[PDB]
Design an enzyme around this catalytic site. Structure first.
Site, mmCIF file in Angstrom:
data_model
loop_
_atom_site.group_PDB
_atom_site.id
_atom_site.type_symbol
_atom_site.label_atom_id
_atom_site.label_comp_id
_atom_site.label_asym_id
_atom_site.label_seq_id
_atom_site.Cartn_x
_atom_site.Cartn_y
_atom_site.Cartn_z
ATOM 1 N N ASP A 39 25.239 63.731 25.944
ATOM 2 C CA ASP A 39 25.625 64.456 26.648
ATOM 3 C C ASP A 39 26.422 65.619 25.920
ATOM 4 O OD1 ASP A 39 27.451 65.956 29.251
ATOM 5 O OD2 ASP A 39 26.310 64.191 30.073
ATOM 6 N N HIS A 69 31.722 68.067 30.909
ATOM 7 C CA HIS A 69 30.822 67.344 31.554
ATOM 8 C C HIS A 69 30.727 65.809 30.674
ATOM 9 C CE1 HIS A 69 26.704 65.801 32.590
ATOM 10 N NE2 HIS A 69 27.056 66.287 33.895
ATOM 11 N N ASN A 161 19.774 66.308 41.097
ATOM 12 C CA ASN A 161 20.532 66.992 42.236
ATOM 13 C C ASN A 161 19.827 67.673 43.131
ATOM 14 O OD1 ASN A 161 22.831 65.114 41.298
ATOM 15 N ND2 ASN A 161 23.338 66.996 39.717
ATOM 16 N N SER A 224 25.089 62.768 38.092
ATOM 17 C CA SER A 224 25.662 62.672 36.594
ATOM 18 C C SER A 224 26.908 61.603 36.877
ATOM 19 C CB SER A 224 26.179 63.911 36.422
ATOM 20 O OG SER A 224 25.076 64.745 35.631
HETATM 21 CA CA LIG Z 1 28.428 63.246 24.641
HETATM 22 CL CL LIG Z 2 26.372 59.675 31.405
#
Ligand SMILES: [Ca+2]
Ligand SMILES: [Cl-]
Ligand SMILES: [Ca+2]
Ligand SMILES: [Cl-]
Ligand SMILES: [Cl-]
Length: 279
Positions: A39, A69, A161, A224
């Site tokens: 990520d 995130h 999404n 997510s």
């Molecule tokens: Ca990461």
């Molecule tokens: Cl994740």
């Protein structure tokens, strides 16, 4: 064990019915397992990770999470207050820049990095990879996720999404990995969640409280946020000896709450992840 006043999604995955607020789980808590979060990075110094998180790889000038995130996802896997598997070890791979974007070639490198890097780490109960990212269909991205699963990592990916069939997105559309849709606190399909026969399981995805950068917290929504509930649940069950990386997705679907969700399209599974803990 019992955690009072938990976030609703933690309570939901340990309950047969919605509307409760305590999280019940075996105290083993994923100890001896490892979860790679692939990520924007992880803020390893956040108090909620207690020294159990570390950055192992980046493809940008820095390895720090300048977005949030990746920290939020890692918090749902394994933070002390907001995490499913509260004793697991978290490894951060930064394939996305601080705007949340990244090339498919970079994401592919990161998946092949994890399949090797697991042989440098101590994870006797098993290894999981959480991928809360996606885009248009790519057979190379799908093959990369299939290699990572084949190498012995439980791969959990977000369905996406778009309120559309996930067959058109990658790595969501890869059949050998665990594709995760999102539900809300009323046991409805989240209104943005993708669907389709390629989905394996649903987890909590709307209004999920977890860690954020700057040592803070916040609540956000998406497939997510659903994906790391399942990633953490996998690591937890593997630590209990119930399943292996190769069969964990099937075991979670076997043991899920069945038929509890509304607004599920015909031909999509009606299965909600459940830890089946009998205190
Ligand atoms: Ca990461
Ligand atoms: Cl994740
Ligand atoms: Ca799949
Ligand atoms: Cl699958
Ligand atoms: Cl269900």
């Amino acid at each position: 064990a019992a955690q009072t006043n938990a976030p609703w999604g933690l309570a939901r995955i340990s309950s047969t019915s919605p509307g409760t607020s305590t999280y019940y789980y075996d105290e083993s808590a994923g100890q001896g397992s490892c979860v790679y979060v692939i990520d924007t990075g992880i803020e390893a110094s956040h108090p909620e990770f207690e020294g159990r998180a570390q950055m192992v790889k980046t493809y940008y000038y820095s390895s720090r999470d300048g977005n949030g995130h990746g920290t939020h996802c890692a918090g749902t896997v394994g933070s002390r207050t907001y995490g499913v598997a509260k004793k697991t070890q978290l490894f951060g791979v930064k394939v996305l820049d601080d705007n949340g974007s990244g090339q498919y070639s970079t994401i592919i490198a990161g998946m092949d990095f994890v399949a090797s890097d697991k042989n440098n780490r101590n994870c006797p109960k098993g290894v999981v990879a959480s991928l809360s990212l996606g885009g248009g269909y790519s057979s190379s991205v799908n093959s990369a996720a299939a290699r990572l699963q084949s190498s012995g990592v439980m791969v959990a990916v977000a369905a996406g999404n778009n309120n559309a069939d996930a067959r058109n997105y990658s790595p969501a559309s890869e059949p050998s990995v665990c594709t995760v849709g999102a539900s809300d606190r009323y046991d409805r399909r989240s209104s943005f969640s993708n669907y389709g026969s390629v989905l394996d399981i649903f987890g909590p995805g709307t209004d999920i409280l977890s860690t954020w950068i700057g040592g803070s917290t916040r609540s956000i929504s998406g497939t997510s946020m659903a994906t790391p509930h399942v990633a953490g649940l996998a690591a937890y069950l593997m630590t209990l000896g119930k399943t292996t990386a190769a069969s964990a997705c099937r075991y979670i679907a076997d043991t899920a709450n069945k038929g509890d969700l509304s607004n599920i399209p015909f031909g999509t599974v009606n299965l909600l992840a459940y830890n089946n803990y009998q205190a």
